[model samples]
Target: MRNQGLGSWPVRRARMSPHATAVRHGGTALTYAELSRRVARLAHGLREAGVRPGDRVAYLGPNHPAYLETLFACGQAGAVFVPLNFRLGVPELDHALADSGASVLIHTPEHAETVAALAGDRLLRVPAGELEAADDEPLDLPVGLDDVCLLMYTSGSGRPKGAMLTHGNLTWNCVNVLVETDLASDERALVAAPLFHAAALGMVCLPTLLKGGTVILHSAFDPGAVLSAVEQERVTLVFGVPTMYQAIAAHPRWRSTDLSSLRTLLCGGAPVPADLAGRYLDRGLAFVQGYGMTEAAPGVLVLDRAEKIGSAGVPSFFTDVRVAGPSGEPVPPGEKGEIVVSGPNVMKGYWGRPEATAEVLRDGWFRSGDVATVDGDGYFHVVDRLKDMIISGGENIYPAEVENELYGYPGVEACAVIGVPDPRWGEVGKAVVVPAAGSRIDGAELLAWLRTRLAGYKVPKSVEFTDRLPTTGSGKILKGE
Candidate 1:
């Protein structure tokens, strides 16, 4: 199962569908042949730019053909491609840049100024289109799976560290998808999510390429643009987060759009709300839920497209998954506990953080910092983030459980639950409120309204509101700094 060489994927895919469209972005198309050629040329540029094998080259841009090109180029050059979250403020990006030790950065015009403003003279910059033409030299490919291919930054999710993904992590993750799910050559995948993130890059783009399917990328997420492109490109699949689907489902053109072309919708980044799932199922759309992280090549599990109410689905075929207690022992079926994964897709370790790496990657299993359960049917259900669990009266309260119920409440926009200091309870669950549009609501009034639906302890001791809650680049809400 050793993946030998950068050509491990690109060359195989090229042989599978040399003339098939590999990418569709902004009226331009790149076939698998052209894409592979461009990747070689870009590898040449990278080599000319002093990117040696094993060097780390980072890409800081949104979802685009260029981003995909750069990633494959990294594969060809046998270097690690670190995808930086563009949404992070200067300080956040600085820490990741300094931490990953990315020698060269490939970025687009949209982020050129910001990188310049933030990168100073410590890093080198390469334009997104600098490698437009293929070099005369033959294509160079990666030699093995053990070679590092990707370095993804995490949200600190519930943990305090990010993971370094190797070629084996990605290649096997694709294997999991290929076996568990069926992908057709005719399918065109919509890549509206950021390429640097897990859902778009690893889940959709890589798998689609592996199957000889076309990937239609969007520079950014736009409800209108995405819907229209699906109509125009006859997109057979769309990779989105729950929030992205919400935006599309809420859009006025949702019903009017030509979505009959869509064969299925793949969701990642978080658990899908029951209401959101019901809406799509009612419309006869196939929905798949994926659970993963930066550490495990971002896809640890996926829900089958069977219209399950709250299941996160099953473990990817490439990995072994278990629900374990705090003591690292396996939990009984139907009991909730932390999710652990072990497989080729799991990362080698955290970059330059052996101590942190040892904490999570133990006994060959990647200890995921989120709680979940395995049901009688062997389906896994994600319960809540470990760090997000609220302690009340010494009893643990997972805020997501409360938040999901709140989603059923009228006039509730998006809501978050956090634990706050409480002298009597030790800590109490606090509901952070954001009312739906056009509703003028106060915290006191909403708390009173919600009290009937939730336990008293779950009610907010205090509420705060800004225009919006803070979010990671992938759109998951963060409680605080």
Candidate 2:
């Protein structure tokens, strides 16, 4: 028989290093062997609940060790795992549930009311303590690499679209991560970002486990808690979005915290403001950055050090990234174009949407709607979202390019540039600014500051200041807002 998919990884790891710590959350820790047994039991429990192979098992909760256990358990039982965003409202949750047609939904106590609203006999509320009592027997099922294993939904798209990732997609991504980043078997990765995102799950968590490393799972993000976890757990690697990093940097304990144990600080989801990258580098840390989308298993490029600080490193070891012009031909170095990716890590397609699938998946390349430029040495600099680009007086202006300049200004805490209708210029740029605490900014002065740094047309035509900008749960600035 052919080898099974990721479902068998926990068992394999258990056999190789039974006593090695696999996961740690709060006060509890589980060895690889212990985790494998629990996963087996959870598999059996799922089977007993009449969850058949190929069925969808949805999970609605925050990050916990049980989340990973349930994921592996679903794999072992030959079922698809759907991790829903806990921040979603009832209407969004209802739509996702109906769309995925989940046969069973497992949640924690905190989400009971939300679960109750969508109540059904299929609900399985699992507590952290209950996992130990699950049946430890192994499951007998044939799972292949091509089997659909994860239905990761994309956010910020108004309506959620599930990206169908096969076992091969995830496993290859793990391999890519292992090769690109120097992840050691002795590594301890701190996962604080919501595990529902593909970057958190595929980039570090799954790869850490695949390498027999320990995962320090955090239920939520708290700046102070993250600092403490790093010092206490001796966390070797950690990942966070730019905004999360900002919060951590701004925390009162940041200066006093012992962060020497951290080997790498991975930042992604959006272009990290250069100042933020400089702050971490100033602390003697290896500040790495990544760029990707959910459709490609979320890992496309990585900048390992402060060497190419502004660019999104190069294409991953097993992945091919190209900057294509409108004709779809590869653009030369320093030229702007659409970013496209191809490799085993790319998703099979969107769940049940053929027409939508065709728009992105073309000729084996997953067209990432991002606009970027590749340097001669192969580093990619993401300019802006293709759809988010502003056309003023027939000249193209990339928001990220303008926003990056704004980040250099002393009092600008956060900013977003969007196109606004203008009677004269067809479409002009408007800058949304979030000023630093106790700092003030005048729109006219900021406009004058922009003119000195950028071309006349590239500078924002208008500026608006705010205490905060609308953002997604992951801290991405919602342009639509």
Candidate 3:
């Protein structure tokens, strides 16, 4: 009964409402009692396999009940949980396993061969009989808030570094989600985004569990399946990136997707494109767009009120977020500045890399290398990443601002603006677009149309077409790709 971290959550929830449905996936549904029992057994299994306090256990798979189980079990066993991005290459995978020094790897069925080749002898696939048959009796562990529980990695300029998240950091993060969103126990959350990312796991799944709500897990994001779940499971709470929503809305069944069950639609990773937001608004739905990165436990600014179309909300209740100058000084209310965050929800630091950690975490503020501007009412509007800014003739152009406008162009399904070297100007933006099906839009016409809507300097220097704009595993558009 001594476990006090995230693992104790289900056990406590079971005590409150043992029969309440906790998780639903495919055709499987488990109550709070069942989930808690499995978590306990999984913890025992970890202990039996030599995973002790401070040891690392990695789970490389898609969204499933076992992902949550292993996370909670890691908390209970006082071991660090590392969730690997399944889409990453073997080199990245090998780096995560070696960097964390994972003792055991619990993978889903499809990833068995991938991990066996990577980890030779380490495999803890779900329903493998060993963990399920392990003792279900709860064990005493000195798990605390300060103890590190998650080693979530982030792709940097070079290699990926684990953003060491503690139980306290995660607990406070969920508190921000609960307070800002006012999540309820009766909420049926649909987790269509990958659980490996911070938003899906920290912003959605963990919050629902802490509030004692049911989370409908998705193996992976399928627009059809997600829409079906809303109708079938009556999913009330949903979290996904903008592209995921665009895909869902573009689906043929979107018109009749029975979206009445949906309540809170949380979109993060990027600001919800205005055109897409307008589409949802037409359906009596509005997105609560959030702004932050994995380092801050992912929740910094959330815009839910006043209908600011492109603004990424004001700061969360628990965190102090601001638009600061290069030296971390606050900027004028309506001027551009870097977004910096400082609060309990900020991560402890990157795993084992002091130089990297020091580069971002200055004094108390974690300097998010992203640019933003404060509106008249203090709403934070995300401009673009600092690194992605284009300098043409001493003028700075934020591509995200241009991309948001590009999304409004008819026949433009997806687009990204990246700086390409220029002879006259230092660098100019090149627009790479994915045209909507059946719309034969040309680069010249698109540019001419945008010249009317945007400043002449801000217009992309050249336009190019691609079948699909490159994106990271979390759906954020990658400029380099």
Candidate 4:
């Protein structure tokens, strides 16, 4: 059989291991064959509900097996899947629905009141007990790799933009992960992060399923609960953002938690602080950090090996990465430049936004809008977001570089360095520090400490103390806030 679109993924895996466990949520477990069957039936249901080829099927729910089933089902039925962030307000949801022109909206019972208020016919509410069932069989719909399978909305510096990810893009990313990581059929993965994020969906979930491994799903993150799942399920792999890992490490049961079965923990959305990495390393665990954005199916660089620690590791297999200078020319290995990626995993373009797409997609290479440097050994170290870089006295200062140093300071719990406008220089660095609980810090003392470590030009001109930093739902620092 031809394996073209992502719909063929589950069929292929089912053929390989029909009886193997595919997905588990709470107490429900489905084998590959069972899951494949369920997805096919759901596809038929979607088709029966007036969902034609190229129509959009939006899902507003938390992390559940049904989400993955719907994602694959959409591909099988030759429709586009749009998974909304449950944390988003009605205004944001309204924009996505209006922009994508989603025909069908499937949501959980908890969201029924809101989903019902929306003007749509197929405002489906899947039962918390089981996935929605249908008896009708779907037609033999053809889907290609070039067909848009997902419309993922991403909010960065401004309003959200819907990235058009093709089946080929997602398939290639799964292949890249399978080739790069030590993934095996017997491995079990714990997924506690929200599936709305590409990192969680592409980085681990789909890849694990493609490998015929077991995926334990969690609707939301809970430090103690994750530890318990890891211990009881013998989870071999886990992926989370830095904040999720921090909570896990800070839990009182952390020291006693039995994480011996874990092969490694994947961290993305942000770099793992050295101190946080140390806590896992102390337990003889590995920390795999990755870097990517929504436009690239979220897998471009991964630092999985111990030798590649601190750096974001090498470009993904079959993906070409370069640090480009101001004029879109490749820079020397040691020089800082905008990180650009070119590969099959790159998204087709932003949905219905040709001008916005043209801004980043150039000559087959996607300008990542991230600043980074590559070592002679081919290892890449992400510096900061291109928009976050500060120019002081004609020298570039990456907030991450300074923030990494601050994380090493004695009393620092969290820190962010931002460039503030100044008359003397184009922009100067400002450090916002959050001291550890019960630990007091002096601004003058901290500045002196930074001066001893960072270059004088890179050091912050002023330091301000804050109890906490505003963060997005994904745990990224909300610089604008």
Global Cα RMSD, each model: 3.1, 2.8, 2.9, 2.9
Point out where model 1 deviates above 4 Å: 1-8, 120-122, 131-134, 139-142, 157-162, 438-451, 455-457, 462-467, 472-481
Model 2: C-alpha RMSD to truth? 2.8
Which candidate tops TM-score? Answer: 2
Q: How accurate locally is residue 36 in candidate 3, as Cα lDDT from 0 to 100? A: 90
The TM-scores, one per candidate, come to 0.91, 0.92, 0.91, 0.91
lDDT, residue 380, model 2: 90
Q: Name the regions of candidate 3 deviating beyond 4 angstroms.
A: 119-129, 408-413, 422-424, 434-453, 464-468, 472-481
Summarize candidate 4's per-residue lDDT along 83-146 as a digit string, tens digits.
9989887778878888888887778788877775665544443443243446534345778888
Q: What is the C-alpha lDDT of each candidate?
A: 0.77, 0.84, 0.83, 0.83
TM-score of 1: 0.91
Backbone Cα, N, C clashes tallied per candidate: 13, 1, 0, 0
Residue-wise lDDT of candidate 3 within 1-481, one digit each (tens)? 6777887787888898789888998888989999999988988888887888999988877888889888988888889999989987767788888887787777777876776567544544342325654578766698888788799898765678899888888888898998889688898999989888889888889998877799999898899988888898889999998889999999999998889888899998777766898799888998888888888888999888456676788888889988999988899868899999999889889899899899889777998998888888878877777887889878998887898789889998778887777899988888888889899898899999889988888998788787766552212444443
Model 3 lDDT at residue 83 = 91
lDDT of 4: 0.83
What local lDDT does model 4 show for residue 101? 87
**Which scores higher on TM-score, 2 or 4?**
2
Candidates 1 and 4: which is better by lDDT?
A: 4
> Once superposed on the true structure, which residue ranges of model 2 sit more than 4 Å away at CA?
1-3, 119-134, 435-440, 472-481
Tens-place lDDT per residue, model 1, 1-481, is: 1336444566667777889988888979988888777777787888788877778788887777777777877777777888888787777877787888788888888777778776655577778877444473435553577777877877764332447777778888888888877788887999888887766777888888888899898887899888898888899988988999999988888888877788878888677777887778777786787888878777788887765667778878778899999888898768889999898888889878898888878888988888898888778888887878878996888888887776666667767877777889888876665677777767786677668877776776766665566542212543351
